[PDB]
């Protein structure tokens, strides 16, 4: 998803966009619930 | 699960690259897709299954050209009878077995 500015993300999900990596990757967790987070 | 993440870690994509849970002998899938171009295997030793057959699969879809079917404790040569099924004329199979075959 960086492919670029902010390492630390936030709940800005805009879930119409969310289905595109769910088709592309189908491991679509969050922006604030990762192992770095 | 660890196999499904094993091929997930190595940057393999999403759509095609799968494992199905279950016994290969009793519930194979895919039958339809296809006679393959390359199968590899490493069947574990002593993977017995009750026969011979416990179902009516003596007259199954794939073990009919064998004539007789493999008993419980010698289930390794079941795999090779499974092996020539899912394989085209172009295909080749590289399987492994126990050495101790005289004629068994």
């Amino acid at each position: 998803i960086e492919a670029t500015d902010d390492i630390k993300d936030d709940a800005i999900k805009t879930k119409g966009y969310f289905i595109y990596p769910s088709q592309l990757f189908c491991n679509v967790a969050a922006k604030a619930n990762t192992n770095d987070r | 699960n660890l196999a499904r993440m094993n091929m997930f870690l190595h940057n393999i994509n999403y759509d095609k690259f799968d494992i199905k849970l279950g016994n290969t002998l009793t519930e194979p899938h895919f039958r339809d897709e296809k006679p393959f171009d390359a199968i590899v295997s490493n069947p574990p030793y002593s993977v017995k299954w009750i026969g011979s057959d416990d179902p009516t699969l003596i007259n199954d879809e794939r073990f009919a050209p064998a004539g007789v079917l493999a008993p419980k404790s010698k289930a390794d040569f079941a795999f090779v009878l499974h092996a020539l099924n899912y394989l085209s004329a172009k295909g080749r199979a590289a399987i492994v077995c126990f050495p101790g075959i005289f004629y068994r």
């Binding site: 966009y17 595109y20 088709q23 | 999403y14 095609k16 416990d54 007259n59 004539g67």
Partner: protein, 992 residues
């Protein structure tokens, strides 16, 4: 008292309006309160838990504190990781918890009192808090979930409309809309395999009960609901909750009632005590006998339950009975001391044995200790080859038994040949499930018996009723006259592609059988095919021939039974004479010569030949199979719709013979074409007389030709159908013919009519006279060569010829016009997305496809630019070919017919031109959007090998040009390029 009801008074509302879901919900709740289900109100998970606690304390008689109840809830009842399967196993296996009280004692907390069902307490709730749902609690645990739907929503789509903790306990989902009612088993699947399994509750004579009122009055009785949900549902291992169809639950409770009411009379071992179930063959008969035997064990006074079969099924049901472990029904061999050990190996007293092992038990031993106990036998597959003397031995050397039998082949006093009836052996017909019900259940399909009345020379012989002369006329004259065989064979080779829906080359079709009487007949039949395929090849050399084989061994061994069955055929190739063995070997050599095999004529080569022959029919390799006796009981295929008969099929060998056709496939296949060549209609009526009334032939077989031509009112369902010619008149007299459809109501009414037209046409195509009437549209007139060949094919005198000239079909170009209009409606209302009301007909229009071959044939044969319009509407007649419109047009707007020398070369010329423009258009699609070139080339060729595209498989998104994985992006040029490439792959689907 039963739960599959015999007599039910059909109740009715007034109404009390029957439309809205609020109405259905209020009326259902009121009716369940009237049946004694307590209605409560719960607004939380915790109050559900408190109710559960109160009900368990009321049942078990124990009292908790908050410590014990917290430990029991967190430890057994509501463990958080445990999914749906764990809860279902807890209802069906682990329904007792060992529990340690705090005053240091151990008791057994039940959940479901499975031996006295009345002690359970039921409650009802609704959900909190869109859907309108009715949940039924058993002792506070939710098990049954009723959903309600909009009445316009068809149930097949209504199925597709799919904290907390206790709602993992659900078993039965009942779905309904006020009109239809089905019930699932624990949230298995989705639309792809949807209504394979969704049953309907019924009465005891298999008449379905569909509306919500009678379903509530009959299924939701407390006794019946608890008894079905607990005592008749198998949690098999694993991922399997099996709920029995109601004709099974019928037979099971008849069995147990007959036992439990014979033991009070103390009336064992005599032919009025037993009885028999008669199922159809192949409906899931294992589970019925399993549950009957398992509930037969758990009567207290019943000691031993034997479960006998015929050879050599024993290991298979020794698995299937063990699919719910563990009934200990083990018999590897008759160690007679080991068998009486198994008689003495106690506590699990269901025994699977052959008739041979029990037979030798009665032979060898004579004074066993078990012969005075309470013994219940259950039999299966009672064809009379291994059954006779063992019943006499069982009547001799036993003292107390009840014998029950399942069957598919009953015997009646209507039958004969010195045998003894089932009722004089078993007793009452306890309950039966015949093919008429399965027809009404839409599980199998209807018949169509036809007598091909075409030969006046032999009409006396093919209609004689004297069975003595039916046997006596077996020679080379009465049945094996050569012109008889030739005219039958000519009929087959002229109407094979018509009956089996192969009138079009791009169509799929089906394939048939051919049953004959003797081997000496069948040799002449196969040689006649062998000669006439050559003679047909010597006329045009364009005729596609047929792949034909045969099999037969041995023999009409004994008389062995009553009238009248297929002889049980064995595998001894050495048992025949020299001639049939020689012919069989020659046929197998011709078989191997094309299929590249080495099946021999020993036991093993013939066995493997049979085991492959049953595989190659199933995937449309062989198109016709000459048959004496085989494949008439055990064979089963979904693409075999046609049985040609020259045989004396009688009473219920006839039913098995006809039943090899009508297994369901899709909306295209509708019923099974039996084409006979002897007098069999009276035999058919006399055979279906054995089932029941004379309404039966109005349900089983088929309506006549004129009744589909004209229109009728059905005496079976009270509908008023419109037939065919009325629909044809409605085509013209309701439309601005043919292509002037613009408003919404015009489009909707045209679809609603023309789908009915396609459906009626597909029913008509099996007939004879509609084939003649379609043949009349293609004739030369006059040209009495053509008219004489016409009347030679179709056997029409000139009065009937002019009469068929009177009746006017619509023009074929008009059919092209309306088909193209229907296809345009379909493609215009595929995009976005009032139209989502009527399902378009697809599978009919999925057929009649032209895969460019007949297109290139018309392009080659045309002489003489002017033809460019015609294909321009021929391409609008086939869905899935709309993109190749511009392709073929630009093939003929660039090259001339002089560029191609003949028909067979312009094919590869078209493929060459297609690839040459394909390369340029691929380069254009790459250049237009500046992609990742080799990556997108790999994507395009992969999608061509895969014949579609998708957003899945991110390598497409690896062809995104420089920067678009990012969230602040339009992601719209992505979808635009996706539309470009799906346009491209449709533009070349099938060429490469």
């Amino acid at each position: 008292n039963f739960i599959v009801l015999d007599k039910y008074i059909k109740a009715e509302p007034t109404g009390d309006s029957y439309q809205s879901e609020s109405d259905l919900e209020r009326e259902l709740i009121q009716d369940l309160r009237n049946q004694g289900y307590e209605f409560i109100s719960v607004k939380s998970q915790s109050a559900m838990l408190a109710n559960v606690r109160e009900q368990l304390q009321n049942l078990n008689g124990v009292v908790f504190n908050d410590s014990e109840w917290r430990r029991f809830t967190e430890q057994y009842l509501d463990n958080p990781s445990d999914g749906i399967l764990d809860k279902t196993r807890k209802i069906h296996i682990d329904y007792i918890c060992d529990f340690i009280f705090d005053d240091e004692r151990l008791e057994n907390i039940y959940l479901i009192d499975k031996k006295n069902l009345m002690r359970n307490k039921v409650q009802i709730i609704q959900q909190f808090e869109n859907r309108y749902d009715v949940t039924i609690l058993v002792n506070g645990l939710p098990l049954v979930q009723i959903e309600l739907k909009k009445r316009g929503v068809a149930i097949r789509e209504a199925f597709n409309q799919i904290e907390n903790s206790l709602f993992k306990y659900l078993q039965l989902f009942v779905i309904s809309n006020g009109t239809d009612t089905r019930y699932f088993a624990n949230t298995t699947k989705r639309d792809k395999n949807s209504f394979d399994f969704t049953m309907n509750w019924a009465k005891s004579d298999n008449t379905l009960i569909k509306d919500l009122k009678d379903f509530t009055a009959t299924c939701f009785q407390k006794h019946t609901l608890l008894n079905v949900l607990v005592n008749y549902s198998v949690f098999d291992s694993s991922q399997t909750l099996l709920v029995m169809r109601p004709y099974q639950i019928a037979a099971t409770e008849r069995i147990l009632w007959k036992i439990k009411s014979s033991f009070t009379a103390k009336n064992w071992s005599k032919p009025e005590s037993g009885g028999y179930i008669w199922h159809t063959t192949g409906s899931g008969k294992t589970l019925t006998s399993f549950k009957a035997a398992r509930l037969a064990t758990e009567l207290d006074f019943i000691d031993k339950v034997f479960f006998v079969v015929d050879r050599k099924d024993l290991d298979y049901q020794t698995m299937k009975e063990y699919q719910r472990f563990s009934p200990d029904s083990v018999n590897g061999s008759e160690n007679t001391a080991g068998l009486k050990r198994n008689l003495d190996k106690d506590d699990n007293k269901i025994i699977v044995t052959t008739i041979q092992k029990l037979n030798n038990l009665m032979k060898a031993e004579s004074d066993l200790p078990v012969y005075n106990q309470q013994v219940v036998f259950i039999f299966d597959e009672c064809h009379r080859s291994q059954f006779g003397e063992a019943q006499k031995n069982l009547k001799k050397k036993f003292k107390r038994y009840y014998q029950f039998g399942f069957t598919g082949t009953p015997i009646f006093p209507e039958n004969a040949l010195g045998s003894e009836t089932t009722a004089s052996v078993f007793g009452r017909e306890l309950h039966s499930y015949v093919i008429t019900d399965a027809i009404r259940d839409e599980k199998v399909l209807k018949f169509k018996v036809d007598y091909n009345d075409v030969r006046p020379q032999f009409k006396s012989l093919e209609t004689e009723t004297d069975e003595k002369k039916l046997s006596a006329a077996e020679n080379q004259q009465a049945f094996l006259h050569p012109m008889r065989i030739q005219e039958i064979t000519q009929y087959i080779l002229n109407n094979f592609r018509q009956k089996t829906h192969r009138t079009f080359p791009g169509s799929k079709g089906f394939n048939a059988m051919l049953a004959v009487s003797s081997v000496d007949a069948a040799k002449a039949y196969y040689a006649t095919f062998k000669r006439l395929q050559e003679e047909a090849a010597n006329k045009s050399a364009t005729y596609k021939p047929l792949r034909i084989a045969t099999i037969f061994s041995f023999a009409a061994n004994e008389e062995q039974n009553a009238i009248g069955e297929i002889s049980d055929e064995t595998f001894d190739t050495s048992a025949m004479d020299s001639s049939a063995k020689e012919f069989l070997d020659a046929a197998i050599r011709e078989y191997n010569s094309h299929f590249k095999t080495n099946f021999s004529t020993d036991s093993n080569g013939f066995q493997n030949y049979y085991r492959d022959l049953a595989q190659r029919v199933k995937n449309q390799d062989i198109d016709l199979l000459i048959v004496v006796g085989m494949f008439l009981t055990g064979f089963d295929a979904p693409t075999l719709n046609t049985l040609f008969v020259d045989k004396n099929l009688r009473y219920h060998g006839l039913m098995q013979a006809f039943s090899r056709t009508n297994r369901i496939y899709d909306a295209t296949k509708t019923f099974g074409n039996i084409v006979t060549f002897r007098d069999l209609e009276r035999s058919t009526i006399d055979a279906i007389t054995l089932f029941g009334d004379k309404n039966t032939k109005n349900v089983v077989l088929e309506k006549s030709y004129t009744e589909y031509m004209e229109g009728f009112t059905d005496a079976a369902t009270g509908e008023a159908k419109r037939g065919f010619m009325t629909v044809v008149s409605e085509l013209e007299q309701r439309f601005p013919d043919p292509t002037s459809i613009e408003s919404e109501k015009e489009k909707k009414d045209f679809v609603k009519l023309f789908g009915e037209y396609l459906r009626a046409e597909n029913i008509l195509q099996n007939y004879d006279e509609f084939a003649t009437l379609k043949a009349l549209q293609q004739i030369d007139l006059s040209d009495p060569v053509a008219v004489e060949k016409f009347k030679a094919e179709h056997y029409v005198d000139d009065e009937k010829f002019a009469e068929l000239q009177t009746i006017r079909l619509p023009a074929d170009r008009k059919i092209q016009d309306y088909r193209s209009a229907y296809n345009d409606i379909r493609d215009w209302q595929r995009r976005e997305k009032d139209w989502d009301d009527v399902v378009f007909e697809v599978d009919l229009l999925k057929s009649q496809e032209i895969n460019l071959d007949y297109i290139l044939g018309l392009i080659f044969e045309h002489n003489r630019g002017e033809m460019i319009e015609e294909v321009k509407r021929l391409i609008r007649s086939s869905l899935g070919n709309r993109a190749k419109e511009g392709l073929v047009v630009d093939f003929i707007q660039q090259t001339n017919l002089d560029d191609l020398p003949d028909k067979a070369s312009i094919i590869d010329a078209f493929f060459t031109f297609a690839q040459r423009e394909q390369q340029r258009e691929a380069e254009a699609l790459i250049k237009e959007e500046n992609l990742n070139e080799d990556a997108a080339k790999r994507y395009i060729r992969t999608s061509l090998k895969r014949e579609y595209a998708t957003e899945n498989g991110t390598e497409l998104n690896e062809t995104l040009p420089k920067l678009s994985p990012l969230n602040p992006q339009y992601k719209t040029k992505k979808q635009a390029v996706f539309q470009k490439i799906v346009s491209f792959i449709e533009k070349f689907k099938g060429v490469g």
